[PDB]
From a paper:
The Omicron variants that have emerged more recently contain similar RBD sequences to BA.2, with the addition of L452 and F486 substitutions—L452Q in BA.2.12.1, L452M in BA.2.13 and L452R/F486V in BA.4 and BA.5—and exhibit a transmission advantage over BA. We expressed and purified the prefusion-stabilized trimeric ectodomains of BA.1, BA.2, BA.3, BA.2.12.1, BA.2.13 and BA.4/BA.5 spike (S-trimer). We determined the cryo-electron microscopy (cryo-EM) structures of these S-trimers at overall resolutions of 3.1–3.5 Å.
All the S-trimers contain Gly-Ser-Ala-Ser (GSAS) and 6P mutations along with the T4 fibritin trimerization domain for increased stability. Of note, one RBD in BA.2.13 was clearly disordered, representing a stochastic movement, which, together with BA.2 and BA.2.12.1, suggests structural heterogeneity in the S-trimers of BA.2 sublineages. By contrast, BA.1, BA.3 and BA.4/BA.5 spike possess relatively tight inter-subunit organization with more buried areas between S2 subunits. In line with structural observations, thermal stability assays also verified that S-trimers from BA.2 sublineages were the least stable among these variants, which might confer an enhanced fusion efficiency. Additionally, the BA.2 subvariants displayed slightly higher binding affinities for hACE2 than the other Omicron variants.
Author numbering:
A (entry chain D): 542 to 590
B (entry chain A): 933 to 1078
C (entry chain B): 981 to 1029
D (entry chain A): 591 to 677, 689 to 736
E (entry chain B): 737 to 835, 849 to 932
F (entry chain A): 835 to 836, 849 to 883
G (entry chain A): 25 to 394
Amino acid sequence: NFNGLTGTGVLTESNKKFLPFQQFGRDIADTTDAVRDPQTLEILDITPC
Amino acid sequence: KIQDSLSSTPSALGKLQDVVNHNAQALNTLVKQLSSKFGAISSVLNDILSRLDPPEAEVQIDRLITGRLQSLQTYVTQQLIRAAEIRASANLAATKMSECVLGQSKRVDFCGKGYHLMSFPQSAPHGVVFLHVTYVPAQEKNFTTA
Amino acid sequence: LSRLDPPEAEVQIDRLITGRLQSLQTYVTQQLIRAAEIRASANLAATKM
Amino acid sequence: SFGGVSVITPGTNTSNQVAVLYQGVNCTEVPVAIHADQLTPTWRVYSTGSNVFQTRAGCLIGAEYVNNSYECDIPIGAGICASYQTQSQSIIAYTMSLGAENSVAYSNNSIAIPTNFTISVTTEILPVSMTKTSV
Amino acid sequence: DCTMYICGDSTECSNLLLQYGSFCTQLKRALTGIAVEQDKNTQEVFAQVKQIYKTPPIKYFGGFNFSQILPDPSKPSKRSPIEDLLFNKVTLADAGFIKLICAQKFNGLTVLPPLLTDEMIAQYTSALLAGTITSGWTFGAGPALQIPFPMQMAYRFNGIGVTQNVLYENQKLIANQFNSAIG
Amino acid sequence: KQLICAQKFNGLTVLPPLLTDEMIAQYTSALLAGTIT
Amino acid sequence: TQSYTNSFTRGVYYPDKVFRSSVLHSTQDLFLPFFSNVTWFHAIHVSGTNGTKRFDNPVLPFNDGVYFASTEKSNIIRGWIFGTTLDSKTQSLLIVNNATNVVIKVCEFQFCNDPFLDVYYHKNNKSWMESEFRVYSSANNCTFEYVSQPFLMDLEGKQGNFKNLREFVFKNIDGYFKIYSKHTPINLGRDLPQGFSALEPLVDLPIGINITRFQTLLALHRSYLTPGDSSSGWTAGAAAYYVGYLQPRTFLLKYNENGTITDAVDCALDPLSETKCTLKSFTVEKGIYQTSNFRVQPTESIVRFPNITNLCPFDEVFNATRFASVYAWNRKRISNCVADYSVLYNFAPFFAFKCYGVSPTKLNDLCFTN
Ligand SMILES: *[C@@H]1O[C@H](CO)[C@@H](O[C@@H]2O[C@H](CO)[C@@H](O)[C@H](O)[C@H]2NC(C)=O)[C@H](O)[C@H]1NC(C)=O
Ligand SMILES: *[C@@H]1O[C@H](CO)[C@@H](O[C@@H]2O[C@H](CO)[C@@H](O)[C@H](O)[C@H]2NC(C)=O)[C@H](O)[C@H]1NC(C)=O
Ligand SMILES: *[C@@H]1O[C@H](CO)[C@@H](O[C@@H]2O[C@H](CO)[C@@H](O)[C@H](O)[C@H]2NC(C)=O)[C@H](O)[C@H]1NC(C)=O
Ligand SMILES: *[C@@H]1O[C@H](CO)[C@@H](O)[C@H](O)[C@H]1NC(C)=O
Ligand SMILES: *[C@@H]1O[C@H](CO)[C@@H](O)[C@H](O)[C@H]1NC(C)=O
Ligand SMILES: *[C@@H]1O[C@H](CO)[C@@H](O)[C@H](O)[C@H]1NC(C)=O
Ligand SMILES: *[C@@H]1O[C@H](CO)[C@@H](O)[C@H](O)[C@H]1NC(C)=O
Ligand SMILES: *[C@@H]1O[C@H](CO)[C@@H](O)[C@H](O)[C@H]1NC(C)=O
Ligand SMILES: *[C@@H]1O[C@H](CO)[C@@H](O)[C@H](O)[C@H]1NC(C)=O
Ligand SMILES: *[C@@H]1O[C@H](CO)[C@@H](O)[C@H](O)[C@H]1NC(C)=O
Ligand SMILES: *[C@@H]1O[C@H](CO)[C@@H](O)[C@H](O)[C@H]1NC(C)=O
Ligand SMILES: *[C@@H]1O[C@H](CO)[C@@H](O)[C@H](O)[C@H]1NC(C)=O
């Protein structure tokens, strides 16, 4: 129930290096793969079921 | 010289590579077709439900359903024709392996350029490779005949 | 365009694009089969030659 | 007025020159006398620049015609091709060559009989199956 | 052409059409593949000779008359009379050419011209005919090998279980029968 | 299997062939031995 | 001092706030076209004993966003002015900077004649110059303000040969103002160095209005590096003040594995480039490709209508004393007149006006028979 994502997955953590002011992670086929943390300012990692 | 010729020229196996390349491209296009609005408010279901009330939100998403069905139909429609042509090629290969390998062939220019002697098959990914051994006259000399 | 305002012109114009796409698809669909027939005939002709 | 536009280019790993083919258009008209703020494509720098040849399949701009006979690389149509080689390098558009000319000798009291052979091994590649899938 | 056929050069129609995704990148690829295949077919069928042969100027093959299939130099195009009849008996609608209903195709429908001109195909056929009447079937193995036509015909008879003396004893009759049959 | 191949989780899978390469190799070896001996 | 120079590969920014890596992505947005002229506008006003009239603040059109580039030390140029007429009867914008602040407002600013200059204009002996002010003459009717963190900050460079070129691109659309900026260092010897750089979003602001000019507020109180010449007609000089114009082009960016854009290609510059855009790859193999179609654009429009003088009597029908019964409705004919359908709203305060076959908005552009 995020701020405009409403995703569903097994999100654990992103180890990738992200640009400071970017939130949405994307792939070749344009699917969400990263979520900013509103509190800890940490990039999450969307992963399907 | 077969090994060296195959290792030098990389375009010899151009018939086998297209088989996987076309399928990969078709699957990629089918996946990419999802990110299309199809003449609707949005291309994502969650937002279109969360932004509108049921009575016209249900109407809006029917366009997505019909567009996705139309996109899915063409894939199998093309796959049927591709499978048919692959079956034709497989039947031709089976005939070649049953005629040239298991005997001698008298058909002109069927199992190789020239006169046919033998044939040895080899296995390749999603295909088969033959090695025809032929006979060719070399040195000419004319005469007078009656 | 010159007789209906855009709010309903978009609705009216969408009923022609779908029909024209459906009419255009059948042409290439049938040509893809005629091409296979012609290719089979060409292979037979090459073998006969 | 409208028509198809095609780009004839060698491999970008080799050179950086291109040629433009206007499909099925008599290029005595506007296509040879193009003007700014008049054509759909944003690029009009080529214009004519000489080296304009008329083909039965359209008009070719940017390739100089030479009358020779080579085995052509890039097909165009109506017995015309193009290739990127020498006449300093540029793009030429010659006429396709079917093969080397040869004349046979025939007589009613002569016959040719071979005296030696040669064993050769060729190859043949045929697909047998394609990758399965499910949805 | 999708854009011109579906939309009459209208910006709004193009903008709404762009929302359907790649429903015309595919339709601009199948036709190109078909055109490539049709260009390859005529090369696969006819282009079977490494070089181009020519019949000798003196034409006497033991009574066999081949004037109805060899090229005719009198005509502007080197085509045999049978080929002339076949060309006349078939009428094409538009071909490629250069530019009553063919002009009503302002709606993005065009026709590309074939790669091989009819003269090149005629030259291929002439080379094949010269090879098959001068050198017999030996030109399909390697280079052409000379042999007189009557002996080739006797050998073809020998290949079907008929003793080769039959032709030499009945050469004139067979030549006349062939001349009447081809005429 | 557990980038595009793992991305096709929308329902587009690829089934494996019934015959592994080590059996087609056995077929080819048997054919070669038969046609040589 | 006006001169023209070619911008090679500058004027590109992040299309959106979204991360993306190790792919090729296509965007359609207002960008700076590749290989376009950029003008150099220079200021010449120094020395106190001797000098000449400056007139060194030209007015720029600001045609739907501009690209700004300038090389200075810390604060030689400050602020940017928008508006449409820049007078007492019209609204004007006052986006200006400060030491550690930014001032942004729109108002009916009347007069901005000349910034406060001490006429000394000599920093070679005394470099004490501060608080010139004279931002505006007066404010009439306005309250909006944007006191916040300053947009531009100075960078420290030691040992020489570290100069930073400042790239500011402004987006004034849909009633909102968007600024994308980034500092490009290593401006050692090349005025417009070849390479590639990326800009980043800063802030948005709902301004609106119909801004149609640009004005510069370069601080001429203490100026330096001021060559002078009569160069004109696509020449070379030195201005340290670059301005560009944005066109609606389409580019195909190449995101790296770290998410930073490395290479960008124009899709409407070169047929080779257009082919690259069509194939969605940076390498194209030898062959022939069918890319697009060409059409001839129109020249002008012509309207041909029949000439009728008298007006249509819609008042006789709507403003009538008596109407007949429903079972004996009377049919009236209107012909041979010019009809205005935007006036029938005044005759009566009706609002049903349910109209079936034609939209009421565009009834004035169709010709009927009766
Ligand atoms: C038929 O061809 C073979 C191969 O070209 C000839 O054998 C060659 O003979 C020469 C000289 O005698 C040698 O230098 C080569 O090394 C031989 N080649 C091989 C592969 O051994 C053979 O002589 C020819 N036949 C006749 C009658 O000349
Ligand atoms: C081979 O056949 C052709 C035609 O079948 C012969 O040409 C004809 O000759 C007769 C008399 O010589 C003429 O009346 C015809 O008009 C000719 N027709 C054509 C099409 O040329 C030709 O003479 C025959 N060859 C030989 C050696 O007799
Ligand atoms: C028909 O009658 C109406 C109402 O009696 C008139 O309506 C006026 O229209 C003018 C047009 O600009 C307005 O300025 C007035 O405010 C309207 N008044 C009212 C009370 O509605 C209308 O003018 C009459 N038609 C004519 C031709 O005079
Ligand atoms: C054999 O052919 C050559 C060249 O084709 C020729 O010079 C020679 O005379 C021919 N032999 C005979 C016996 O005619
Ligand atoms: C092309 O146009 C020229 C000039 O109008 C004309 O002479 C010619 O017949 C036309 N057709 C061609 C060259 O096929
Ligand atoms: C053919 O080539 C010759 C020799 O280069 C040249 O003089 C002539 O102009 C050419 N003809 C054409 C039609 O290009
Ligand atoms: C071979 O043909 C020539 C050409 O007419 C002829 O003169 C000669 O007699 C023929 N040979 C024989 C053995 O008849
Ligand atoms: C599946 O489980 C086996 C057994 O532990 C393991 O060896 C293999 O790596 C697993 N496959 C994965 C993790 O893709
Ligand atoms: C840019 O400068 C060149 C140099 O002469 C000039 O021809 C051109 O008109 C200018 N403008 C554009 C848009 O290229
Ligand atoms: C600049 O900032 C200082 C400190 O915040 C402030 O006192 C001053 O008024 C500002 N200048 C303007 C013109 O607002
Ligand atoms: C503009 O400001 C003046 C006072 O400076 C005020 O009287 C006037 O009403 C304002 N304009 C509008 C449209 O309110
Ligand atoms: C991406 O970041 C890594 C980590 O420092 C670096 O090694 C690599 O060179 C970067 N890729 C570039 C700069 O293209």
